[PDB]
Design a protein around this ligand. Sequence first.
Ligand SMILES: [Mg+2]
Lengths: 79, 82
Amino acid sequence: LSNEDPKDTLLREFQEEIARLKAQLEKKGMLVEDLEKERDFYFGKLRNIELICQENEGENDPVLQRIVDILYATDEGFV
Amino acid sequence: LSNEDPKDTLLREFQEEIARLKAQLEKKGMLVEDLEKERDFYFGKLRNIELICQENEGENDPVLQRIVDILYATDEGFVIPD
Ligand SMILES: [Mg+2]
């Protein structure tokens, strides 16, 4: 059991908790940035595949139409 | 100005700051989960597309080959189709 004034104990502990929370926020911010990069990466692939379907008359090609259906599905387009 | 002990003032203000930071951390956690769901949504579409390319393996379809090239690309950015 400490001999310190409890108010002094808590002022120190609360400042340590504030610092810890700020550090956790920085860590979660970097996770967000990583996830934005991965999300952008996969969306960029979908966009590039859409451009291929557009260049190659996807609406006149039955296999490409099924890929187009996935591109524009509001769910994952699973069949 | 108040007659409050400055230590009592800071004990209250520090706990208010802790509560605000915990709320910010919850919000960032929600953003992480939103981004994971969006990323998984797009990955699932790409996986479904790859299965259609797999189904057509043996046809030598050059448009499907260009799609597979995108699926397995390592670089970011737009690819202008030919
Ligand atoms: Mg052409």
